Design a protein around this ligand. Structure first.
Ligand code: LTM
Length: 645
């Protein structure tokens, strides 16, 4: 399964051996980045004047003259051919030759090559990743791994703009990077160049920018320092700000100045991009002059970014028409998935879908804003690369499966299992949701409906739930111990622990559904302990300020387990005249369920705590009171008690 799939492909359903002896033509004249890859593939083998011809080069080179008519007339296009007599790897340009090689590397398996002819090129000009989220910026090592991954998947764009990098945003946007970070950035740029990726350095100055000479020059001076580090593409971001920096005439004038005094003055600058203050339809004022001013005043080589109809949204024909009419050029899409910075307790590991696949001509670029979890984001990134290169042939589920097999071949099925039940965002303020657990959703819905009603459930539905919980546990334990991609396992580990507990809880609740009073009570007590363990994980892992903790299988599996538990406990309580607690989340404090978030104890919008704590403050909203470290166990009257914990 070639990813991205080529524009055109003819296969012969024959294979040949990769030539043990070969003659290489054009090795001195072709893209050195491409020749390096070819040479690594042919290692062990060796070149002579005999043996199979392998021709590599760009249109115009001597090596590929014979094929000049077969080379697509598109930027980054290439012609590839393998038959009994020779191998052709011919780009329309240097990047095309490299892309030819990335396809060729995928064809080669166990020293054999299929006989094929490919004519290929991207449907969207700029394809890649914007590291543009809130949260811990990607590590240096993660970024090195990302750049290599993008080369392999024909992504030509990496936009560097982590919101919490102080040299990117306010106020240290004015300051050059310190030496250590500068040497790292310099290495990232070299590695990007090696993998045919435009390293685009973004700046986010709008929150405190002054529309004067001093700040303009400081911005230019910053861009110059980035240029000295090897940066050749640049962006200015005006998103998520308020105040004078939102002025569209001034934004456009600054961007045109950068264009005219910098971009068009250096020998070798590539992309110049801006993200507008009105960057999605809902945050736009259809009766305001912001977008039309940008559209009219911004120089036509400057790109303008867009997230769609909402902050988080998928791209539609009508949605992109709306923006394109105003900005007078094709939007450069900033797709906010799988970014999880507003649902930080979730991993978003499901397929990439929802974007119109017929609108390539309506977009200048398409980049995906990922999770702060770099390796985990490769599922979506791989899929986005496939979509942007060939949207007409974009296959949601096959691409997801291909991504997973590429990222973790040693445990692909296990990672599929984990990812398939870790897809949805849960309720959020952006209203954006994804499907999850859709395979078992009907079996779950029928089981629950029957059970709650006192009608009999289908045995096969019970067994499918059983099968699911079993596979979840196998998948969790195998992933925990996997050493093929350690950085990935480090990222997902807390969710993997939570996912295993979920599956164990499901097994026990199903045993509760099935014997005698004694047995039921053993199962019940086991489930209570597992709820407590899930609490401990939710309280100790991923403790960020915004959405702390660890949620998993939230769409279908957890509600099924919880509702089944509440139901069987009710039945037991009726049958045995008992008063077993049916609550589904463990809560050590007593009172709408209470919630614990960090050192906050809140009522879901008299409380007795499990101990005496020093009080910090109380916040109510139908109000606030400093508690000045006073001992507190009881609070009697949002409704949030903060304690020292
Ligand atoms: C253009 C844009 O999307 N800006 C920000 C934004 O508005 N939302 C996403 C998702 O929270 C942020 O990561 C991103 O930095």
């Amino acid at each position: 399964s070639l990813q991205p799939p080529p524009q055109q492909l003819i296969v012969q359903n024959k294979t040949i051996d990769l030539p043990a002896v070969y003659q290489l033509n054009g090795g001195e004249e072709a893209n050195p980045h491409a020749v390096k890859v070819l040479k690594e593939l042919l290692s062990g083998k060796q070149s002579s004047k005999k043996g199979m011809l392998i021709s590599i080069g760009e249109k115009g080179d001597k090596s590929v003259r014979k094929y000049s008519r077969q080379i697509p007339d598109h930027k980054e296009g290439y012609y590839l051919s393998v038959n009994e007599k020779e191998i052709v790897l011919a780009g329309n340009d240097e990047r095309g030759t490299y892309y030819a090689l990335q396809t060729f590397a995928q064809l080669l398996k166990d020293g054999k090559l299929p006989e094929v002819e490919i004519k290929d090129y991207p449907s969207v000009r700029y394809r890649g990743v914007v590291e543009g989220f809130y949260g811990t910026p990607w590590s240096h090592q993660a970024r090195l791994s990302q750049l290599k991954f993008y080369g392999k998947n024909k992504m030509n764009t990496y936009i560097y703009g982590p919101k919490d990098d102080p040299y990117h945003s306010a106020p240290n946007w004015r300051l050059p990077y310190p030496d250590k970070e500068a040497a790292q950035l310099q290495e990232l740029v070299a590695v990007a160049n090696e993998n045919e990726v435009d390293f685009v350095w973004a700046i986010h100055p709008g929150q405190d920018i002054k529309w004067n000479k001093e700040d303009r020059d400081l911005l230019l001076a910053k861009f110059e320092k980035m240029y000295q580090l090897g940066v050749r593409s640049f962006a200015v971001f005006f998103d998520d700000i308020s105040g004078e920096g939102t002025n569209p005439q001034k934004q456009a004038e600054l961007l045109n100045y950068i264009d005219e005094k910098f971009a068009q003055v250096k020998p070798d600058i590539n992309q110049l991009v801006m993200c507008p203050t009105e960057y999605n339809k809902s945050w736009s004022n259809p009766n305001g002059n912001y977008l039309t001013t940008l559209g009219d005043k911004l120089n036509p080589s400057i790109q303008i970014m867009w997230t769609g109809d909402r902050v988080i949204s998928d791209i539609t024909r009508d949605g992109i028409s709306w923006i394109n009419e105003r900005i007078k050029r094709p939007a450069y899409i900033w797709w906010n998935f799988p970014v999880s910075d507003y649902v930080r307790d979730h991993l978003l590991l499901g397929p990439v879908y929802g974007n119109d696949t017929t609108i390539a001509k309506e977009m200048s670029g398409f980049v995906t804003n990922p999770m702060e979890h770099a390796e985990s984001s490769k599922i979506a990134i791989y899929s986005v690369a496939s979509y942007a290169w060939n949207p007409a042939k974009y296959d949601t589920w096959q691409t997801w499966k291909d991504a997973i097999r590429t990222i973790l071949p040693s445990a692909a099925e296990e990672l599929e299992c984990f990812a398939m039940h870790n897809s949805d965002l849960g309720p959020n303020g952006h209203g954006y949701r994804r499907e999850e657990s859709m395979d078992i959703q009907p079996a779950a819905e029928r089981f629950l409906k029957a059970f709650k009603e006192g009608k009999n459930y289908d045995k096969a539905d019970f067994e499918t739930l059983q099968y699911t919980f079993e596979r979840m546990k196998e998948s969790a334990d195998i992933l925990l111990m996997n050493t093929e991609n350690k950085p990935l396992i480090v990222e997902i580990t807390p969710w993997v622990h939570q996912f295993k507990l979920t599956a164990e809880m499901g097994e026990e609740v199903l045993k509760m559904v099935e014997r005698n009073e004694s047995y039921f009570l053993r199962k019940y007590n086991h489930v209570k302990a597992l709820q407590q363990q899930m609490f401990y994980i939710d309280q100790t892992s991923n403790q960020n300020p915004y959405q702390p903790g660890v949620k998993t299988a939230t769409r279908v599996i957890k509600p099924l387990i919880d509702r089944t538990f509440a139901t069987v406990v009710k039945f037991f309580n009726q049958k045995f005249n008992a008063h077993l607690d049916a609550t589904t989340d463990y809560m050590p404090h007593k009172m709408l369920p209470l919630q614990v978030k960090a050192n906050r104890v809140l009522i879901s919008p008299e409380i007795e705590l499990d101990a005496i704590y020093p009080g910090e403050n109380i916040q109510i909203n139908f109000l606030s009171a400093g508690l000045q470290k006073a001992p507190v166990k009881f609070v009697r009257f949002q409704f949030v008690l903060t304690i020292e914990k």
